[PDB]
Amino acid sequence: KFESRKIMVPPHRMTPLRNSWTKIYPPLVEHLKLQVRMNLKTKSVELRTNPKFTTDPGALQKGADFIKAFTLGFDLDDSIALLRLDDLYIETFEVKDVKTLTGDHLSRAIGRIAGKDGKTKFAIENATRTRIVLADSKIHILGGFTHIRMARESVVSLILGSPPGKVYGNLRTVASRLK
């Protein structure tokens, strides 16, 4: 009979969701034969399967993350790699855990992560082979377990303090042999 996952959508991600529908189901419902229902008032991201919608074991595991990982700020391009690896995982931060941060110390230690015109962010976009989203304090990583170990040690001192050029000047002691 019926077999279901269920997830809702946070309402600051509602607005990047209803304008991002047109090419998320043709990469899903022509390969993954299902049906899902979007609406405007109950925010129900409803996806369920059946034995008639083949109930083979490894089919309810990585197909949800084409939109379950889109909702955490990523695009539809990166998250197909869930169905490529058994060591392709996610990482969610909470910025108020690195220190006791308060006030403009949570703006003078965010702006030194993306960098001036994304040029520290683009520089991490050639170091760990990841995608990293800045919502306000949500930072999410689609890496692969040793990439996110060196992505957790990529914001080792972007917050608590060392210069951003010394992210490749001082931290090159860690950013080489990139045990």
């Binding site: 269920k6 809702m8 959508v9 309402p11 409803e46």
Partner: protein
């Protein structure tokens, strides 16, 4: 330590009789030696599952049930209602940048020498005519919404029994005193009632139901 082999049988669980699906699945009981450990494990246990199972509605109704098992009747277990909460799936999916939460609580020695603690939370509303970014009540009206909801959770537990509370939830007649007797201040939307904590039974009776058998 004692008898490491024959700790194996399967006893199911009967839902409380006010709901649809009694027979909701077997569980592995390990007690053949002494039927008080097979009673202590079957006289006070919160066995939390979804309200999608009990009433029948495709939402895991957000409303999953603390369901304290009560008594044994022979390969079937007598039960009543204990409590309820919101799962974080719907509770967190609501909070936009510009609204205001409204919080309430009522604890009162209710009608069976029971003390029910009902949590009920409310939310402000961008009205259909609202062209503000926001909805903040004029914070006496943040108090005045919170002080006129203060009578609704009082009367709607002062008048009810233990049965009628869950039965006043499926269209939520409670809401039809929330949204019909606190609507007189500011517009509200997506408002609910949160938790049904019966933590204090300050009287625990002896216990022989015989009428919620199922």
């Amino acid at each position: 330590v004692v008898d490491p082999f024959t700790r194996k049988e399967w006893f199911d669980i009967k839902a409380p009789s006010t709901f649809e699906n009694r027979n909701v699945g077997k569980t592995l009981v390990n007690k053949s030696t002494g039927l008080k450990s097979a009673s202590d494990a079957l006289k006070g246990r919160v066995v939390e599952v979804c309200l999608a199972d009990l009433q029948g509605s495709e939402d895991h109704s957000f409303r999953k049930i603390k369901l304290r098992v009560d008594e044994v009747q022979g390969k079937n277990l007598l039960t009543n209602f204990h409590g309820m909460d919101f799962t974080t799936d719907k509770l967190r999916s609501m909070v936009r940048k510009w609204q205001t939460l409204i919080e309430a609580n009522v604890t009162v020695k209710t009608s069976d020498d029971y003390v029910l603690r009902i949590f009920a939370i409310a939310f402000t509303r961008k009205q259909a005519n609202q062209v503000k970014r926001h909805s903040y009540a004029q914070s006496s009206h943040i108090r005045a919404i919170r002080k006129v909801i203060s009578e609704i959770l009082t009367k709607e537990v002062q008048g009810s029994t233990l049965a009628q509370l869950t039965s006043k939830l499926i269209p939520e007649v409670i809401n039809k005193e929330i949204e019909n007797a606190t609507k007189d201040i500011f517009p509200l939307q997506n408002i609910h009632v949160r938790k049904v904590k019966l933590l204090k039974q300050p009287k625990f009776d002896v216990g022989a139901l015989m009428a919620l058998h199922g």
